């Protein structure tokens, strides 16, 4: 086994060379390795077919490594790959759309704390098996249509800490079985109704800290079975336009947060969840 690593077959075959100051992926990683650990090094690249001979690789960790570019090939024969953590590489900024193409059995994929500015075309094409998909704290500006379409088992989608400015119909389409997506700490101005139009089964949604003035009507409608909704820290305007949300909150059985009206004044500071129906004026004008 390569130096600066410990190798064992014990539970599953591991290579493990974490925090060993490695500058690049060592050449001698034994092929019949099941799980490989390379986080905490200084590996700045994942060149084409870096783990090819490891046909039985289940777990692979490269997080916290000053990654800069990950060859479109990279994970090529890692068909049995389950977890692939590339988190904490604020210098990556991007992943060639065809990168994860194979990765069928992929269960969990971490791409958080990465300079990801955009989510390319088929970045997540047919990742079917995927359930956990971490994408918090990147530079993502928008969620383009059908971006998570093929992700049918996805039950955990984290997108907070980005720069998403709005949620269009397209995004979150095939996301059936999605149990909880967080969108907090984003710049969400508008949430197109129907945007959650098959986002049922969803257990918990987060939209706090987001620059939302008021939510459309049919917006929270599909969220039958929702149990946790966090809407604090938003410029909630409270005029007749808030009725739909006001209403949706009253009939809500689950657990909500505080929806602080931050406008108009005179009502400013009060929480929409406790305003009486006729507190919302300034109608059709
Ligand atoms: C809860 C559910 O729908 N189970 C299926 C599972 O049978 C299948 O193996 C997987 C694909 O890897 O998709 C879904 O997770
Ligand atoms: C545990 C098991 O199924 N055995 C195979 C083994 O025959 C093969 O040599 C190896 C490739 O390195 O992949 C393993 O999965």
PDB file of C-alpha atoms and ligand atoms in Angstrom:
ATOM      1  CA  UNK A   1       0.000   0.000   0.000  1.00  0.00           C
ATOM      2  CA  UNK A   2       1.139   3.565  -0.667  1.00  0.00           C
ATOM      3  CA  UNK A   3       3.110   5.184   2.112  1.00  0.00           C
ATOM      4  CA  UNK A   4       1.216   7.715   4.212  1.00  0.00           C
ATOM      5  CA  UNK A   5      -1.742   5.341   4.260  1.00  0.00           C
ATOM      6  CA  UNK A   6      -2.979   2.445   6.311  1.00  0.00           C
ATOM      7  CA  UNK A   7      -4.615  -0.437   4.585  1.00  0.00           C
ATOM      8  CA  UNK A   8      -7.047  -2.992   5.801  1.00  0.00           C
ATOM      9  CA  UNK A   9      -9.496  -5.534   4.446  1.00  0.00           C
ATOM     10  CA  UNK A  10     -11.232  -5.875   7.865  1.00  0.00           C
ATOM     11  CA  UNK A  11     -14.852  -4.775   7.443  1.00  0.00           C
ATOM     12  CA  UNK A  12     -14.474  -3.760   3.813  1.00  0.00           C
ATOM     13  CA  UNK A  13     -11.220  -2.987   1.979  1.00  0.00           C
ATOM     14  CA  UNK A  14     -10.026   0.503   2.914  1.00  0.00           C
ATOM     15  CA  UNK A  15      -7.089   2.609   1.755  1.00  0.00           C
ATOM     16  CA  UNK A  16      -7.330   5.655   4.053  1.00  0.00           C
ATOM     17  CA  UNK A  17      -4.680   8.411   3.761  1.00  0.00           C
ATOM     18  CA  UNK A  18      -6.551  11.288   5.358  1.00  0.00           C
ATOM     19  CA  UNK A  19      -4.788  14.475   6.416  1.00  0.00           C
ATOM     20  CA  UNK A  20      -1.449  13.167   5.238  1.00  0.00           C
ATOM     21  CA  UNK A  21      -0.542  16.290   3.350  1.00  0.00           C
ATOM     22  CA  UNK A  22      -0.938  14.551  -0.009  1.00  0.00           C
ATOM     23  CA  UNK A  23      -0.665  16.929  -2.995  1.00  0.00           C
ATOM     24  CA  UNK A  24      -2.205  14.480  -5.491  1.00  0.00           C
ATOM     25  CA  UNK A  25      -3.889  11.115  -5.728  1.00  0.00           C
ATOM     26  CA  UNK A  26      -1.173   8.481  -4.986  1.00  0.00           C
ATOM     27  CA  UNK A  27      -0.494   5.963  -7.725  1.00  0.00           C
ATOM     28  CA  UNK A  28      -0.436   2.789  -5.667  1.00  0.00           C
ATOM     29  CA  UNK A  29      -4.015   2.730  -4.361  1.00  0.00           C
ATOM     30  CA  UNK A  30      -4.686  -1.026  -4.334  1.00  0.00           C
ATOM     31  CA  UNK A  31      -7.317  -1.779  -6.991  1.00  0.00           C
ATOM     32  CA  UNK A  32      -9.445  -4.182  -4.978  1.00  0.00           C
ATOM     33  CA  UNK A  33     -10.130  -1.399  -2.500  1.00  0.00           C
ATOM     34  CA  UNK A  34     -13.710  -0.989  -1.355  1.00  0.00           C
ATOM     35  CA  UNK A  35     -13.597   2.457   0.285  1.00  0.00           C
ATOM     36  CA  UNK A  36     -10.880   5.106  -0.179  1.00  0.00           C
ATOM     37  CA  UNK A  37     -10.278   8.052   2.173  1.00  0.00           C
ATOM     38  CA  UNK A  38      -8.312  11.113   0.908  1.00  0.00           C
ATOM     39  CA  UNK A  39      -9.899  14.066   2.683  1.00  0.00           C
ATOM     40  CA  UNK A  40      -7.770  16.704   4.356  1.00  0.00           C
ATOM     41  CA  UNK A  41      -4.894  16.500   1.910  1.00  0.00           C
ATOM     42  CA  UNK A  42      -3.927  19.145  -0.662  1.00  0.00           C
ATOM     43  CA  UNK A  43      -4.902  17.141  -3.728  1.00  0.00           C
ATOM     44  CA  UNK A  44      -5.624  19.837  -6.304  1.00  0.00           C
ATOM     45  CA  UNK A  45      -6.799  17.496  -9.105  1.00  0.00           C
ATOM     46  CA  UNK A  46      -8.718  14.273  -9.814  1.00  0.00           C
ATOM     47  CA  UNK A  47      -7.243  13.483 -13.245  1.00  0.00           C
ATOM     48  CA  UNK A  48      -8.947  11.241 -15.774  1.00  0.00           C
ATOM     49  CA  UNK A  49      -9.432   7.675 -14.581  1.00  0.00           C
ATOM     50  CA  UNK A  50      -7.754   8.220 -11.163  1.00  0.00           C
ATOM     51  CA  UNK A  51      -9.548   5.298  -9.523  1.00  0.00           C
ATOM     52  CA  UNK A  52     -10.393   3.188 -12.609  1.00  0.00           C
ATOM     53  CA  UNK A  53      -8.899  -0.115 -11.415  1.00  0.00           C
ATOM     54  CA  UNK A  54     -11.032   0.145  -8.266  1.00  0.00           C
ATOM     55  CA  UNK A  55     -14.122  -1.392  -9.829  1.00  0.00           C
ATOM     56  CA  UNK A  56     -15.498  -2.234  -6.334  1.00  0.00           C
ATOM     57  CA  UNK A  57     -15.159   1.230  -4.792  1.00  0.00           C
ATOM     58  CA  UNK A  58     -18.190   1.962  -2.595  1.00  0.00           C
ATOM     59  CA  UNK A  59     -17.082   4.973  -0.621  1.00  0.00           C
ATOM     60  CA  UNK A  60     -14.760   7.703  -1.817  1.00  0.00           C
ATOM     61  CA  UNK A  61     -13.890  10.874   0.146  1.00  0.00           C
ATOM     62  CA  UNK A  62     -11.941  13.796  -1.333  1.00  0.00           C
ATOM     63  CA  UNK A  63     -13.311  16.642   0.757  1.00  0.00           C
ATOM     64  CA  UNK A  64     -11.125  19.487   2.053  1.00  0.00           C
ATOM     65  CA  UNK A  65      -8.486  19.308  -0.641  1.00  0.00           C
ATOM     66  CA  UNK A  66      -7.988  22.509  -2.614  1.00  0.00           C
ATOM     67  CA  UNK A  67      -9.491  20.727  -5.623  1.00  0.00           C
ATOM     68  CA  UNK A  68      -9.480  22.936  -8.721  1.00  0.00           C
ATOM     69  CA  UNK A  69     -10.594  20.760 -11.597  1.00  0.00           C
ATOM     70  CA  UNK A  70     -12.065  17.251 -11.631  1.00  0.00           C
ATOM     71  CA  UNK A  71     -11.474  15.514 -14.974  1.00  0.00           C
ATOM     72  CA  UNK A  72     -14.770  14.740 -16.732  1.00  0.00           C
ATOM     73  CA  UNK A  73     -13.630  11.116 -16.689  1.00  0.00           C
ATOM     74  CA  UNK A  74     -12.475  10.824 -13.081  1.00  0.00           C
ATOM     75  CA  UNK A  75     -15.086   8.481 -11.683  1.00  0.00           C
ATOM     76  CA  UNK A  76     -15.454   6.268 -14.743  1.00  0.00           C
ATOM     77  CA  UNK A  77     -15.770   2.639 -13.728  1.00  0.00           C
ATOM     78  CA  UNK A  78     -17.022   3.431 -10.258  1.00  0.00           C
ATOM     79  CA  UNK A  79     -20.376   1.872 -11.035  1.00  0.00           C
ATOM     80  CA  UNK A  80     -20.736   0.584  -7.477  1.00  0.00           C
ATOM     81  CA  UNK A  81     -19.930   3.969  -5.963  1.00  0.00           C
ATOM     82  CA  UNK A  82     -22.365   4.860  -3.182  1.00  0.00           C
ATOM     83  CA  UNK A  83     -20.964   7.910  -1.415  1.00  0.00           C
ATOM     84  CA  UNK A  84     -18.754  10.427  -3.156  1.00  0.00           C
ATOM     85  CA  UNK A  85     -17.901  13.472  -1.002  1.00  0.00           C
ATOM     86  CA  UNK A  86     -16.193  16.365  -2.780  1.00  0.00           C
ATOM     87  CA  UNK A  87     -17.177  18.990  -0.222  1.00  0.00           C
ATOM     88  CA  UNK A  88     -15.136  21.935   1.044  1.00  0.00           C
ATOM     89  CA  UNK A  89     -13.225  22.645  -2.147  1.00  0.00           C
ATOM     90  CA  UNK A  90     -13.980  26.330  -2.563  1.00  0.00           C
ATOM     91  CA  UNK A  91     -11.710  26.425  -5.592  1.00  0.00           C
ATOM     92  CA  UNK A  92     -13.521  23.894  -7.778  1.00  0.00           C
ATOM     93  CA  UNK A  93     -16.130  26.389  -9.017  1.00  0.00           C
ATOM     94  CA  UNK A  94     -17.416  23.791 -11.464  1.00  0.00           C
ATOM     95  CA  UNK A  95     -18.035  20.215 -12.533  1.00  0.00           C
ATOM     96  CA  UNK A  96     -18.154  19.175 -16.217  1.00  0.00           C
ATOM     97  CA  UNK A  97     -21.763  18.159 -16.826  1.00  0.00           C
ATOM     98  CA  UNK A  98     -20.781  14.574 -17.768  1.00  0.00           C
ATOM     99  CA  UNK A  99     -18.911  13.936 -14.501  1.00  0.00           C
ATOM    100  CA  UNK A 100     -21.444  11.883 -12.621  1.00  0.00           C
ATOM    101  CA  UNK A 101     -23.037  10.235 -15.680  1.00  0.00           C
ATOM    102  CA  UNK A 102     -22.151   6.675 -14.685  1.00  0.00           C
ATOM    103  CA  UNK A 103     -22.494   6.590 -10.879  1.00  0.00           C
ATOM    104  CA  UNK A 104     -25.719   4.631 -10.948  1.00  0.00           C
ATOM    105  CA  UNK A 105     -25.724   3.242  -7.435  1.00  0.00           C
ATOM    106  CA  UNK A 106     -24.771   6.667  -6.075  1.00  0.00           C
ATOM    107  CA  UNK A 107     -26.674   7.179  -2.780  1.00  0.00           C
ATOM    108  CA  UNK A 108     -25.030  10.295  -1.360  1.00  0.00           C
ATOM    109  CA  UNK A 109     -23.143  13.096  -3.136  1.00  0.00           C
ATOM    110  CA  UNK A 110     -21.673  16.121  -1.326  1.00  0.00           C
ATOM    111  CA  UNK A 111     -20.815  19.191  -3.413  1.00  0.00           C
ATOM    112  CA  UNK A 112     -21.299  21.759  -0.675  1.00  0.00           C
ATOM    113  CA  UNK A 113     -18.786  24.455   0.191  1.00  0.00           C
ATOM    114  CA  UNK A 114     -17.625  24.435  -3.431  1.00  0.00           C
ATOM    115  CA  UNK A 115     -17.434  27.527  -5.611  1.00  0.00           C
ATOM    116  CA  UNK A 116     -20.148  26.006  -7.790  1.00  0.00           C
ATOM    117  CA  UNK A 117     -21.535  28.982  -9.682  1.00  0.00           C
ATOM    118  CA  UNK A 118     -23.885  27.089 -11.989  1.00  0.00           C
ATOM    119  CA  UNK A 119     -25.513  23.659 -12.186  1.00  0.00           C
ATOM    120  CA  UNK A 120     -24.737  22.545 -15.728  1.00  0.00           C
ATOM    121  CA  UNK A 121     -27.138  20.759 -18.157  1.00  0.00           C
ATOM    122  CA  UNK A 122     -27.174  17.056 -17.309  1.00  0.00           C
ATOM    123  CA  UNK A 123     -25.005  17.331 -14.190  1.00  0.00           C
ATOM    124  CA  UNK A 124     -27.336  15.006 -12.350  1.00  0.00           C
ATOM    125  CA  UNK A 125     -28.484  12.877 -15.298  1.00  0.00           C
ATOM    126  CA  UNK A 126     -30.008   9.577 -14.179  1.00  0.00           C
ATOM    127  CA  UNK A 127     -28.458   9.444 -10.707  1.00  0.00           C
ATOM    128  CA  UNK A 128     -31.606   7.467  -9.755  1.00  0.00           C
ATOM    129  CA  UNK A 129     -30.236   5.802  -6.617  1.00  0.00           C
ATOM    130  CA  UNK A 130     -29.360   9.229  -5.143  1.00  0.00           C
ATOM    131  CA  UNK A 131     -31.115  10.139  -1.851  1.00  0.00           C
ATOM    132  CA  UNK A 132     -28.876  12.778  -0.233  1.00  0.00           C
ATOM    133  CA  UNK A 133     -27.576  15.595  -2.463  1.00  0.00           C
ATOM    134  CA  UNK A 134     -25.706  18.336  -0.547  1.00  0.00           C
ATOM    135  CA  UNK A 135     -25.337  21.662  -2.321  1.00  0.00           C
ATOM    136  CA  UNK A 136     -25.200  24.282   0.435  1.00  0.00           C
ATOM    137  CA  UNK A 137     -22.947  27.276   0.452  1.00  0.00           C
ATOM    138  CA  UNK A 138     -21.895  27.601  -3.146  1.00  0.00           C
ATOM    139  CA  UNK A 139     -22.363  30.492  -5.548  1.00  0.00           C
ATOM    140  CA  UNK A 140     -25.429  29.049  -7.260  1.00  0.00           C
ATOM    141  CA  UNK A 141     -27.533  31.862  -8.754  1.00  0.00           C
ATOM    142  CA  UNK A 142     -30.449  29.935 -10.207  1.00  0.00           C
ATOM    143  CA  UNK A 143     -32.077  26.527 -10.298  1.00  0.00           C
ATOM    144  CA  UNK A 144     -32.666  25.824 -14.009  1.00  0.00           C
ATOM    145  CA  UNK A 145     -35.608  23.695 -15.186  1.00  0.00           C
ATOM    146  CA  UNK A 146     -35.621  19.955 -14.541  1.00  0.00           C
ATOM    147  CA  UNK A 147     -32.263  20.129 -12.798  1.00  0.00           C
ATOM    148  CA  UNK A 148     -33.157  17.356 -10.328  1.00  0.00           C
ATOM    149  CA  UNK A 149     -35.578  15.498 -12.633  1.00  0.00           C
ATOM    150  CA  UNK A 150     -34.003  12.056 -12.740  1.00  0.00           C
ATOM    151  CA  UNK A 151     -33.382  12.126  -8.926  1.00  0.00           C
ATOM    152  CA  UNK A 152     -36.326   9.981  -7.854  1.00  0.00           C
ATOM    153  CA  UNK A 153     -35.191   8.690  -4.481  1.00  0.00           C
ATOM    154  CA  UNK A 154     -33.834  12.031  -3.379  1.00  0.00           C
ATOM    155  CA  UNK A 155     -35.137  12.594   0.161  1.00  0.00           C
ATOM    156  CA  UNK A 156     -32.678  15.266   1.175  1.00  0.00           C
ATOM    157  CA  UNK A 157     -31.891  18.267  -0.976  1.00  0.00           C
ATOM    158  CA  UNK A 158     -29.878  21.051   0.726  1.00  0.00           C
ATOM    159  CA  UNK A 159     -29.458  24.327  -1.188  1.00  0.00           C
ATOM    160  CA  UNK A 160     -29.192  26.913   1.566  1.00  0.00           C
ATOM    161  CA  UNK A 161     -26.395  29.442   1.761  1.00  0.00           C
ATOM    162  CA  UNK A 162     -26.367  30.010  -1.958  1.00  0.00           C
ATOM    163  CA  UNK A 163     -27.572  32.907  -4.068  1.00  0.00           C
ATOM    164  CA  UNK A 164     -30.716  31.357  -5.548  1.00  0.00           C
ATOM    165  CA  UNK A 165     -32.967  34.334  -6.291  1.00  0.00           C
ATOM    166  CA  UNK A 166     -36.203  32.600  -7.201  1.00  0.00           C
ATOM    167  CA  UNK A 167     -37.922  29.241  -7.685  1.00  0.00           C
ATOM    168  CA  UNK A 168     -39.383  28.572 -11.149  1.00  0.00           C
ATOM    169  CA  UNK A 169     -41.864  25.865 -12.189  1.00  0.00           C
ATOM    170  CA  UNK A 170     -39.227  23.645 -13.834  1.00  0.00           C
ATOM    171  CA  UNK A 171     -36.883  23.146 -10.815  1.00  0.00           C
ATOM    172  CA  UNK A 172     -37.891  20.428  -8.326  1.00  0.00           C
ATOM    173  CA  UNK A 173     -39.850  18.480 -10.922  1.00  0.00           C
ATOM    174  CA  UNK A 174     -39.217  14.754 -10.605  1.00  0.00           C
ATOM    175  CA  UNK A 175     -38.275  15.225  -6.935  1.00  0.00           C
ATOM    176  CA  UNK A 176     -40.946  12.830  -5.739  1.00  0.00           C
ATOM    177  CA  UNK A 177     -40.237  11.276  -2.306  1.00  0.00           C
ATOM    178  CA  UNK A 178     -38.210  14.385  -1.406  1.00  0.00           C
ATOM    179  CA  UNK A 179     -38.633  14.514   2.395  1.00  0.00           C
ATOM    180  CA  UNK A 180     -36.873  17.812   3.139  1.00  0.00           C
ATOM    181  CA  UNK A 181     -35.303  20.604   1.133  1.00  0.00           C
ATOM    182  CA  UNK A 182     -33.882  23.711   2.770  1.00  0.00           C
ATOM    183  CA  UNK A 183     -33.660  26.991   0.867  1.00  0.00           C
ATOM    184  CA  UNK A 184     -32.788  29.377   3.689  1.00  0.00           C
ATOM    185  CA  UNK A 185     -30.092  32.015   3.550  1.00  0.00           C
ATOM    186  CA  UNK A 186     -30.842  32.493  -0.177  1.00  0.00           C
ATOM    187  CA  UNK A 187     -31.992  35.590  -2.130  1.00  0.00           C
ATOM    188  CA  UNK A 188     -35.401  34.106  -3.072  1.00  0.00           C
ATOM    189  CA  UNK A 189     -37.643  36.926  -4.321  1.00  0.00           C
ATOM    190  CA  UNK A 190     -40.350  34.934  -6.091  1.00  0.00           C
ATOM    191  CA  UNK A 191     -41.652  31.395  -5.702  1.00  0.00           C
ATOM    192  CA  UNK A 192     -43.727  30.562  -8.757  1.00  0.00           C
ATOM    193  CA  UNK A 193     -46.921  28.699  -7.796  1.00  0.00           C
ATOM    194  CA  UNK A 194     -46.965  25.032  -8.755  1.00  0.00           C
ATOM    195  CA  UNK A 195     -43.192  25.132  -8.131  1.00  0.00           C
ATOM    196  CA  UNK A 196     -43.953  22.496  -5.537  1.00  0.00           C
ATOM    197  CA  UNK A 197     -46.485  20.771  -7.808  1.00  0.00           C
ATOM    198  CA  UNK A 198     -45.471  17.166  -6.953  1.00  0.00           C
ATOM    199  CA  UNK A 199     -43.349  18.055  -3.978  1.00  0.00           C
ATOM    200  CA  UNK A 200     -45.984  16.320  -1.857  1.00  0.00           C
ATOM    201  CA  UNK A 201     -44.747  13.840   0.748  1.00  0.00           C
ATOM    202  CA  UNK A 202     -42.373  16.695   1.660  1.00  0.00           C
ATOM    203  CA  UNK A 203     -41.965  16.728   5.445  1.00  0.00           C
ATOM    204  CA  UNK A 204     -40.010  19.932   6.018  1.00  0.00           C
ATOM    205  CA  UNK A 205     -39.328  23.097   4.008  1.00  0.00           C
ATOM    206  CA  UNK A 206     -37.046  26.056   4.948  1.00  0.00           C
ATOM    207  CA  UNK A 207     -37.363  29.492   3.376  1.00  0.00           C
ATOM    208  CA  UNK A 208     -36.201  31.732   6.195  1.00  0.00           C
ATOM    209  CA  UNK A 209     -33.752  34.551   5.508  1.00  0.00           C
ATOM    210  CA  UNK A 210     -34.748  35.002   1.872  1.00  0.00           C
ATOM    211  CA  UNK A 211     -36.142  38.315   0.615  1.00  0.00           C
ATOM    212  CA  UNK A 212     -39.702  37.095  -0.033  1.00  0.00           C
ATOM    213  CA  UNK A 213     -42.443  39.754   0.006  1.00  0.00           C
ATOM    214  CA  UNK A 214     -45.414  37.386  -0.131  1.00  0.00           C
ATOM    215  CA  UNK A 215     -46.069  33.858  -1.418  1.00  0.00           C
ATOM    216  CA  UNK A 216     -48.458  33.251  -4.379  1.00  0.00           C
ATOM    217  CA  UNK A 217     -51.689  31.346  -3.862  1.00  0.00           C
ATOM    218  CA  UNK A 218     -51.333  27.767  -5.088  1.00  0.00           C
ATOM    219  CA  UNK A 219     -47.712  27.778  -3.752  1.00  0.00           C
ATOM    220  CA  UNK A 220     -47.929  25.912  -0.438  1.00  0.00           C
ATOM    221  CA  UNK A 221     -50.934  23.982  -1.705  1.00  0.00           C
ATOM    222  CA  UNK A 222     -49.266  20.718  -2.774  1.00  0.00           C
ATOM    223  CA  UNK A 223     -47.506  20.488   0.566  1.00  0.00           C
ATOM    224  CA  UNK A 224     -50.014  18.029   1.998  1.00  0.00           C
ATOM    225  CA  UNK A 225     -48.210  16.147   4.779  1.00  0.00           C
ATOM    226  CA  UNK A 226     -45.767  18.994   5.410  1.00  0.00           C
ATOM    227  CA  UNK A 227     -44.822  19.244   9.105  1.00  0.00           C
ATOM    228  CA  UNK A 228     -42.186  21.961   9.406  1.00  0.00           C
ATOM    229  CA  UNK A 229     -42.169  25.316   7.664  1.00  0.00           C
ATOM    230  CA  UNK A 230     -39.614  28.047   8.456  1.00  0.00           C
ATOM    231  CA  UNK A 231     -40.507  31.479   6.981  1.00  0.00           C
ATOM    232  CA  UNK A 232     -38.798  33.944   9.339  1.00  0.00           C
ATOM    233  CA  UNK A 233     -36.416  36.686   8.280  1.00  0.00           C
ATOM    234  CA  UNK A 234     -38.217  37.854   5.142  1.00  0.00           C
ATOM    235  CA  UNK A 235     -39.738  41.242   4.209  1.00  0.00           C
ATOM    236  CA  UNK A 236     -43.233  39.859   4.612  1.00  0.00           C
ATOM    237  CA  UNK A 237     -45.586  42.574   3.384  1.00  0.00           C
ATOM    238  CA  UNK A 238     -49.014  42.304   5.001  1.00  0.00           C
ATOM    239  CA  UNK A 239     -51.759  43.611   2.796  1.00  0.00           C
ATOM    240  CA  UNK A 240     -54.702  41.826   1.166  1.00  0.00           C
ATOM    241  CA  UNK A 241     -52.028  40.095  -0.921  1.00  0.00           C
ATOM    242  CA  UNK A 242     -51.111  38.085   2.159  1.00  0.00           C
ATOM    243  CA  UNK A 243     -54.514  36.487   2.596  1.00  0.00           C
ATOM    244  CA  UNK A 244     -53.637  33.227   0.843  1.00  0.00           C
ATOM    245  CA  UNK A 245     -50.606  32.681   3.107  1.00  0.00           C
ATOM    246  CA  UNK A 246     -52.412  34.048   6.113  1.00  0.00           C
ATOM    247  CA  UNK A 247     -55.113  31.522   5.418  1.00  0.00           C
ATOM    248  CA  UNK A 248     -52.782  28.620   4.713  1.00  0.00           C
ATOM    249  CA  UNK A 249     -51.148  29.241   8.085  1.00  0.00           C
ATOM    250  CA  UNK A 250     -54.416  29.223  10.052  1.00  0.00           C
ATOM    251  CA  UNK A 251     -55.475  25.845   8.644  1.00  0.00           C
ATOM    252  CA  UNK A 252     -51.940  24.470   8.903  1.00  0.00           C
ATOM    253  CA  UNK A 253     -51.779  21.602  11.421  1.00  0.00           C
ATOM    254  CA  UNK A 254     -48.018  21.157  11.387  1.00  0.00           C
ATOM    255  CA  UNK A 255     -45.443  23.367  13.083  1.00  0.00           C
ATOM    256  CA  UNK A 256     -44.778  26.796  11.580  1.00  0.00           C
ATOM    257  CA  UNK A 257     -42.372  29.563  12.578  1.00  0.00           C
ATOM    258  CA  UNK A 258     -43.014  33.267  13.003  1.00  0.00           C
ATOM    259  CA  UNK A 259     -43.942  35.146   9.809  1.00  0.00           C
ATOM    260  CA  UNK A 260     -42.976  38.735  10.705  1.00  0.00           C
ATOM    261  CA  UNK A 261     -44.786  41.360   8.691  1.00  0.00           C
ATOM    262  CA  UNK A 262     -42.100  43.932   7.958  1.00  0.00           C
ATOM    263  CA  UNK A 263     -44.486  46.175   6.066  1.00  0.00           C
ATOM    264  CA  UNK A 264     -46.691  48.181   6.069  1.00  0.00           C
ATOM    265  CA  UNK A 265     -45.751  49.971   9.283  1.00  0.00           C
ATOM    266  CA  UNK A 266     -48.391  50.110  12.027  1.00  0.00           C
ATOM    267  CA  UNK A 267     -48.574  46.370  11.498  1.00  0.00           C
ATOM    268  CA  UNK A 268     -44.803  46.096  11.179  1.00  0.00           C
ATOM    269  CA  UNK A 269     -43.309  43.869  13.817  1.00  0.00           C
ATOM    270  CA  UNK A 270     -46.466  41.810  14.100  1.00  0.00           C
ATOM    271  CA  UNK A 271     -46.519  38.172  13.012  1.00  0.00           C
ATOM    272  CA  UNK A 272     -48.835  37.217  10.196  1.00  0.00           C
ATOM    273  CA  UNK A 273     -49.656  33.996  12.001  1.00  0.00           C
ATOM    274  CA  UNK A 274     -51.595  36.018  14.592  1.00  0.00           C
ATOM    275  CA  UNK A 275     -53.157  38.831  12.580  1.00  0.00           C
ATOM    276  CA  UNK A 276     -56.952  38.758  12.480  1.00  0.00           C
ATOM    277  CA  UNK A 277     -58.467  38.243   9.024  1.00  0.00           C
ATOM    278  CA  UNK A 278     -59.409  41.926   8.758  1.00  0.00           C
ATOM    279  CA  UNK A 279     -55.941  43.201   9.685  1.00  0.00           C
ATOM    280  CA  UNK A 280     -55.026  42.805   6.028  1.00  0.00           C
ATOM    281  CA  UNK A 281     -56.381  45.835   4.159  1.00  0.00           C
ATOM    282  CA  UNK A 282     -55.328  47.912   1.175  1.00  0.00           C
ATOM    283  CA  UNK A 283     -57.264  45.649  -1.175  1.00  0.00           C
ATOM    284  CA  UNK A 284     -57.845  45.844  -4.924  1.00  0.00           C
ATOM    285  CA  UNK A 285     -56.365  49.300  -5.542  1.00  0.00           C
TER     286      UNK A 285
HETATM  287  C1  LIG B   1     -38.511   3.873  -1.487  1.00  0.00           C
HETATM  288  C2  LIG B   1     -38.372   3.465  -2.949  1.00  0.00           C
HETATM  289  O1  LIG B   1     -39.062   4.030  -3.823  1.00  0.00           O
HETATM  290  N1  LIG B   1     -37.495   2.487  -3.203  1.00  0.00           N
HETATM  291  C3  LIG B   1     -36.810   2.376  -4.491  1.00  0.00           C
HETATM  292  C4  LIG B   1     -35.837   1.152  -4.459  1.00  0.00           C
HETATM  293  O2  LIG B   1     -36.583  -0.066  -4.548  1.00  0.00           O
HETATM  294  C5  LIG B   1     -34.813   1.179  -5.606  1.00  0.00           C
HETATM  295  O3  LIG B   1     -33.776   0.243  -5.338  1.00  0.00           O
HETATM  296  C6  LIG B   1     -34.212   2.569  -5.758  1.00  0.00           C
HETATM  297  C7  LIG B   1     -33.225   2.651  -6.905  1.00  0.00           C
HETATM  298  O4  LIG B   1     -31.907   2.388  -6.439  1.00  0.00           O
HETATM  299  O5  LIG B   1     -35.256   3.531  -5.996  1.00  0.00           O
HETATM  300  C8  LIG B   1     -36.080   3.705  -4.836  1.00  0.00           C
HETATM  301  O6  LIG B   1     -35.264   4.100  -3.777  1.00  0.00           O
HETATM  302  C1  LIG B   2     -16.300  -9.465  -2.828  1.00  0.00           C
HETATM  303  C2  LIG B   2     -16.508  -9.921  -4.276  1.00  0.00           C
HETATM  304  O1  LIG B   2     -17.635  -9.887  -4.779  1.00  0.00           O
HETATM  305  N1  LIG B   2     -15.437 -10.337  -4.955  1.00  0.00           N
HETATM  306  C3  LIG B   2     -14.950  -9.604  -6.116  1.00  0.00           C
HETATM  307  C4  LIG B   2     -13.612 -10.224  -6.577  1.00  0.00           C
HETATM  308  O2  LIG B   2     -13.841 -11.520  -7.144  1.00  0.00           O
HETATM  309  C5  LIG B   2     -12.870  -9.336  -7.599  1.00  0.00           C
HETATM  310  O3  LIG B   2     -11.546  -9.845  -7.796  1.00  0.00           O
HETATM  311  C6  LIG B   2     -12.799  -7.895  -7.076  1.00  0.00           C
HETATM  312  C7  LIG B   2     -12.108  -6.922  -8.009  1.00  0.00           C
HETATM  313  O4  LIG B   2     -11.052  -6.242  -7.334  1.00  0.00           O
HETATM  314  O5  LIG B   2     -14.123  -7.391  -6.832  1.00  0.00           O
HETATM  315  C8  LIG B   2     -14.790  -8.103  -5.770  1.00  0.00           C
HETATM  316  O6  LIG B   2     -16.039  -7.520  -5.557  1.00  0.00           O
END
